[PDB]
Amino acid sequence: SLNRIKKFWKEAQYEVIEHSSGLKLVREWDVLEQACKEQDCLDLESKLTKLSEIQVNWVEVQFYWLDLYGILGENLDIQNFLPLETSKFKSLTSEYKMITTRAFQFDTTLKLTIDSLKMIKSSLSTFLERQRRQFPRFYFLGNDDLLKIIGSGKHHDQVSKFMKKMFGSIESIIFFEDSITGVRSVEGEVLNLNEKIELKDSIQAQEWLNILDTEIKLSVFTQFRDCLGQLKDGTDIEVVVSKYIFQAILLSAQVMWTELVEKCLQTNEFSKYWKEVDMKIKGLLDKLNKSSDNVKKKIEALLVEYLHFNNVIGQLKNCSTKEEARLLWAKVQKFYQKNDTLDDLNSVFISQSGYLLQYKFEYIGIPERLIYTPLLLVGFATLTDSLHQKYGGCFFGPAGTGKTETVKAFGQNLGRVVVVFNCDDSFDYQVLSRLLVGITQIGAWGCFDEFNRLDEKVLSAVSANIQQIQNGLQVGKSHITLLEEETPLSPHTAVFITLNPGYRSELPENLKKSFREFSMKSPQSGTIAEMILQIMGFEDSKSLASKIVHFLELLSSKCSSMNHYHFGLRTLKGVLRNCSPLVSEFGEGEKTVVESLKRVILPSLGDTDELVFKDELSKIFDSSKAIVQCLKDAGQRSGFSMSEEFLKKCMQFYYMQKTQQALILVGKAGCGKTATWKTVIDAMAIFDGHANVVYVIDTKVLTKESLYGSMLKATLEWRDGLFTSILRRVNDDITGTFKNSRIWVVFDSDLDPEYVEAMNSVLDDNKILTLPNGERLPIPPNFRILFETDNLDHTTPATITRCGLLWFSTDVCSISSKIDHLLNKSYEALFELDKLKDLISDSFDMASLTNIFTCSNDLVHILGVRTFNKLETAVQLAVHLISSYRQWFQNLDDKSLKDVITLLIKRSLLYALAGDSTGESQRAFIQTINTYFGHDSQELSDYSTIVILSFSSFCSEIPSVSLEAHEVMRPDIVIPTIDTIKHEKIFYDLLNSKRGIILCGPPGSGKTMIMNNALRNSSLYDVVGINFSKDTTTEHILSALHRHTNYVTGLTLLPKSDIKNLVLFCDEINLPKLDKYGSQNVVLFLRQLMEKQGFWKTPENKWVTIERIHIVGACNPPTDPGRIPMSERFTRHAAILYLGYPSGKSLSQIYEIYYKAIFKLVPEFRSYTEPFARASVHLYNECKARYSTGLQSHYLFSPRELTRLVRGVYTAINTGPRQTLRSLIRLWAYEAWRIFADRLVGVKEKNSFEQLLYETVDKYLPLGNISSTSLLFSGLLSLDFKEVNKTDLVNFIEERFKTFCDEELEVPMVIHESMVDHILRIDRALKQVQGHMMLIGASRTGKTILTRFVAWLNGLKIVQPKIRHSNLSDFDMILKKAISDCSLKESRTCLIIDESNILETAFLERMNTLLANADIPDLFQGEEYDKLLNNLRNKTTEQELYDWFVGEIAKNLHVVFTICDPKSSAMISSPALFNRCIINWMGDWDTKTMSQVANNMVDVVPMEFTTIRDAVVNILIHFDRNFYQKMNPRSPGYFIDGLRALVKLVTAKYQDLQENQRFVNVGLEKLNSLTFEKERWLNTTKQFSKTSQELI
Amino acid sequence: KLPAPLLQRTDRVVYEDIPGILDTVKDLWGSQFFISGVWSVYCTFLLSWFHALITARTRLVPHGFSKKYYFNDCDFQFASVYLENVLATNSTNNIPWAQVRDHIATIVYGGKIDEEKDLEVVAKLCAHVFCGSDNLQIVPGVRIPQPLLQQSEEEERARLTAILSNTIEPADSLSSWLQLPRESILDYERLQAKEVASSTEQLLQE
Amino acid sequence: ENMSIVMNSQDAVPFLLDPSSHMITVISNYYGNKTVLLSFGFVKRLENAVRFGSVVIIQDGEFFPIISRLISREFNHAVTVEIGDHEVDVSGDFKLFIHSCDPIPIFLRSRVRLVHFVTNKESIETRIFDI
């Protein structure tokens, strides 16, 4: 190991994969770390520990040099910022260069290097800390934003972009001629600073930011003072609205209102000031009707406040007594200003419920002003009460009840920006505590929005910090000691918490003692809506608001309890926001509200919900064609038909995407979502004139690393995902296409929670994307996402209202309309064309077709696909049939042509609508088809076929093929019958019709067989067959297509051949298991190929168009164990055929052909082939009918058992002597017993099989005893398979057993009759072709030892894999070594696999495919496949070489399974394991076997000295029965260990007693005073017999 | 949930303090040292009586309230400071009893209460205690006369303590003093005995 | 009698299903410095302990298959045991134990000498009768 480690370190090097020069870079860290993980040993251990320290230094040094090269290798301003810091970074660069040189070309030097790296990182940390202390609003940013700002020294840029993050309500800096005149708010408002901020090259970032912040506060104060003086001078507000910013007019108007209402409250006078305020409101509304956008926002916010003033004054006027008037005036917020204080910024204080607070003069912009409701003022009052004693204001209640907005409005009224902690699982501890300390040091207010959504550890960790903050505030502390630093504590900070208890938890106790909780469950949606409508200009606003609230209440109470229904306040405010663009057309009235309710709420409702909506809208409320015409034109261009439902849904989607930037289209598969949005996009392109670029991205097929992008564990290099790539390509707009074109990203798959956690911030109001590398990508207005789902089971209620939801409750078509569209599309896919189109179109007479579809829905369909989704198969099949027969149509009469067309349409309908049903249901459906068309047309029968043009039948085509004797070993020989030809013909039609096929059927029904028969005899198609497993990925399919397909520009995927289309046979597509969120990767990938004809490359993000690749499937029904039903969105794209078990006639025909082939070997009995066929078929039919799966999990039978019986009879005849009739009958009976009755339950069931076989012989083959113990067959005692004699057989096997035990292992096995019979049976099963074992027997029943003995006697070699911490790589390495030894040495293998070694179902599926074929294709690919072919060429046409490889594996491979308990249950019912491995029932031991084993093993111990043996054996077996019946097979491990322990204990104790008796006899002889000794000796001799009996 | 090994090797006791109304009033009065005139002391007396009454009414889950709340010393401190601030800013001896009534009922004590029924329960008790009338029969036995305008605060503390010493707590204080019907507390006793007897039945049929 | 059954087993490796982790402590005290404790480079340290001849105790019995030869006592005499992919000599002093603290595959169940420690109402009766 030391030499290997030394060689590995001497071979250790570096990879040139970096950019520019940097450092040399290393890859594959995990392998090196796993390899790395007395003086020589001590030196090696010290070297390894030092190496681990050096690799820690290495990973940390690139982890730091990511940012260090980001800010130092491409930005000299940071490294030249401060002089001592410049020298420090110069030393940094020199050390970096010197360690780079010595890495290209030392232990203490590199220890000093990592020490210096820690020192410089600490220095950079304290430098950023000092930068944050100078400007504590830096401390809201990450490290990288700080580095960018401090590098923007003399640039004045990129510090205007992060000031939304730093300042909360600033969008950008404005600067003219290197001087600052103000800032821009988020709402576009400009703030005019009092004086320009002079700037030079010799300036620091934090210095001018401090000047800017203090000047912002002083400028807001100055605007407030000027506005207040102007309003005091009698100047109207209508002229000063457009003069100063919103905050100044806000505070000045509030101060004037407070002063005037107090002056008029000192007396009983309110009407004058009420009229003044009302006139101000009316003037503001009149100006709002005719003002610009910024003035619109200003007047809207001032109107919120003036309606609050009007409400308060109206409340005060109606008070009967002055005491209640003073009470009502004390409850509202009151604004004052000091006069004696010359300090400008502390001159305004605010009084609520007696207590006082301070205005802070921070700039806020024009925020969305909350409507002043009484609950809002009570929330203000309790927040004031909590703040007055330096407590914390807490809020609890239901979700969406106005808590965070109330905290934000409190902060806005108090002239400050409340920084909001959007608490979720994304906020880890360090950023949360950092922004907490920023809120502490600034003096800002931190609202913990949704505080109950934290994890437990982070909730406790930050509850400690909030408790420390509150305890510092309460006692008037100056500094708080949290995060290991004594940060300043400004006495103006606060912490608010809004949470939802039991939705979840309550406030923790440590925070419960420092806070004051409050419940605010019910917002007043009435007065909110009334004030919003009054602001928006509606003439009747109060009654309209009451109507809207009542209607939303009725919809919440009457409609169904679906998850995506939200009828609360957010929906109401969305309706009100959508009213105004409809106000611009309909007008200010009820019609606008009704139409906005239809545009906003109605898309998300169902059908009965739609009726409820219409009824309540008619009861409560009283009550554009250009885009409709353009939609109709675009639909007629696209082939669709404008039904009323389809036009309604198209209009809804268009009017709804008018406002919302991302939509969710929900509805059952086939309802018309993609057609809807494609029609809408085409119509919008035609109407508006903008070009439209569309992109379809199935969500679940691509993983999130492929969708977005991720780092590298060794290099940390960002790789663009698909969505990030397309967004960057539309952000850059290099060519210029994406400046005047709408760009759509359609997520045409199912929503996923863990996928949408990274989509939420994309869908947030910021329209920004969160990436691991720190890049932020904006979303343009014309970048609209679309979703297309079929269910919303895992969609959180956070995104149902964040994203627009459109609901498709029913189909947008009739059946006839889809038939017409499919016909036209298939015609366009293609003097004869027009008449052909006319005939195909008018032969679809809907009057009978309606009854046909309604009589085809009711039949039992397996893999149930809706009746509306069979239309594609029916129409496309009929069109392709007529287009195939078009050549000979110019020379036939109209009657015969009409009959031919009618027959082909009948065939299409029969094999589309009820092609997925049983045989009898097919007869019923064809009877219905023949009835409903009428009897004048050609009658399609069960076997009608068209030959070139005349009526024909399938019965006159089948070839009577005569295979020779030795082709029954080949598993792919297909005996053609009527059903096989029918299924191959319909398969060819459905394959050529550009349609997918699904072959659903029971195990052994002939799915793979008819599959490969159909596309092995075809010269126009080829198979890439795949067997699926539980753990299947998308890359498995691409690996399967790797050797048959080529990439051509890769923008297009083509088969490697040039004349044959490729067929992707995917066997058992039910195996891909659901993920944690109920979806499968492989079947969604298949849906993507069959629907959209292409897929997205995962490393390049390119659309690889599919041209000539088909997809077919073959899977067991979903009701079987181990299978999961597939999504109907995929199965609606594939025509479904049902393959039942063949009938008795076809079975007897196939197996009489097999018996002719086998009796060509023995021609003297060539006339008895048919009775043998009826014998085998009748025996299997009885074994299936009388024995069902309800008895055991292995009571399944198929034609595979008959084929195995034929192969066994063939190998016994070939390896046997000359045969009589009696010998042939007894050989067939013995083979039938060994194949069929290797699994029957009891002796009664086996006797029933024996009488069945006797009756079968007496009925078909006109007898000695033919039981399992009478037909003793072997080949060990002779040179051929014959009946040998028991005495010589047992003597030979006992002698060879003695040789085994004396040569290899000292195993004390016990030989018995059951063991002899079972080693005979397993030697028989290992003497066949493709012999494998499913040995059902309890533990320690001798199964593995018997297998090893048989393998030793037959010359097999033994390999037993060492299966913990082992995987498919090591398993395939061992298997490759074993198969290479088998191929290059002809060494027959006995590969032992126990049930303790089958850890994963992937191993089971590997053997399952192995036994489906006689080999596995993907084990050998690439270099290993080339090496295998070279070795085959050296030892001995690729097809012939692989055929011989398959043959030699099938003849020279024997893997066995040892199972005790029958994850392993699905193995038994698995069809391809059921193919060739023989299930041997060892059985639990019975009384006879237990007694025989005990008698044979205890016979070598002297015990008959106190018969005893039979009595003690009966005692032991009966106590074992009592134990197992008073405490599944019953193990003899306890039994065998007990007998062994008894044997050794008896031997040792008898030896000890013999020694004691010899010593006592010697003492007695020596002794022979003495009377007592003689008496004692006599007593001992008398009691010795009882002592011996007691001993035993 | 405390950890099981910590709760195992230890001796556990479950405590139950006296739910007596007069004992809680006496404890609150003794813990207070009042300082603003005589009216601050009088309002502290009223607040102590109200807090004791509401804490005693809390214990009766189905009838005294609808849920189990927890009014404690911090809530008492907030109410006392609000009374001090009301008396400080209003020195014209026209005390805004409506202000303290609504603020204590809706914001101080009724902040944590979400159900409406408990809210007018608290409102009724606030209206009774803080009525500010000339004659105040807090319970049908004792009365608290208002302070007169010619004395000091120490004699007022002495007089209210003397009123406390004269008071005797009857055995039916859970219904007579809390203005509850006798059938209500009888039903509460019936429910507690019923749950005890039913649980003994379930534990006894095993 | 549990200890007697544990240490009167020369042919099968004993099993110690002890949830209180008392059996592991008592056998570590009994064996002194020779106790080498493992749980489910553990294969490498198992091979080194087998070559040295040290007693090995393995916890987490419910997570039991690479020790199949050692648990079944299938040795080659030339005494050599082929563990993993290399034949390893046996010093003869090697003893193996299996421990579990969670009161199992059938191969593990029926190849060892299972010893169980449990308390119930019968244990309560026995303890109060003894007192």
Ligand SMILES: Nc1ncnc2c1ncn2[C@@H]1O[C@H](COP(=O)(O)OP(=O)(O)OP(=O)(O)O)[C@@H](O)[C@H]1O
């Ligand atoms: N207006 C129409 N007139 C006629 N046929 C139509 C019309 N709209 C849609 N169809 C038919 O409906 C079929 C359903 O396909 P479509 O793409 O609309 O489904 P979908 O809603 O996207 O379903 P899925 O969820 O399975 O993807 C189309 O193939 C088309 O033939």
Ligand SMILES: Nc1ncnc2c1ncn2[C@@H]1O[C@H](COP(=O)(O)OP(=O)(O)O)[C@@H](O)[C@H]1O
């Ligand atoms: N004056 C108001 N009072 C209460 N709610 C309002 C007012 N104005 C608007 N709202 C609406 O109430 C909603 C409050 O939800 P929010 O408090 O954010 O819930 P949570 O904080 O629990 O997520 C907002 O969507 C807002 O549109």
Ligand SMILES: Nc1ncnc2c1ncn2[C@@H]1O[C@H](COP(=O)(O)OP(=O)(O)O)[C@@H](O)[C@H]1O
């Ligand atoms: N027409 C037929 N001619 C010859 N053999 C048939 C025919 N129909 C069924 N069989 C036998 O039935 C078995 C079908 O098994 P298979 O189709 O491989 O199962 P699965 O469909 O589960 O893969 C084969 O072993 C085959 O020999």
Ligand SMILES: Nc1ncnc2c1ncn2[C@@H]1O[C@H](COP(=O)(O)OP(=O)(O)O)[C@@H](O)[C@H]1O
């Ligand atoms: N009938 C038997 N007679 C003697 N020993 C047995 C017998 N059956 C099992 N054993 C013991 O079990 C060990 C192997 O049993 P094995 O064949 O692996 O049973 P299983 O395959 O059911 O686990 C052998 O070393 C042997 O000592």
Ligand SMILES: [Mg+2]
């Ligand atoms: Mg198959």
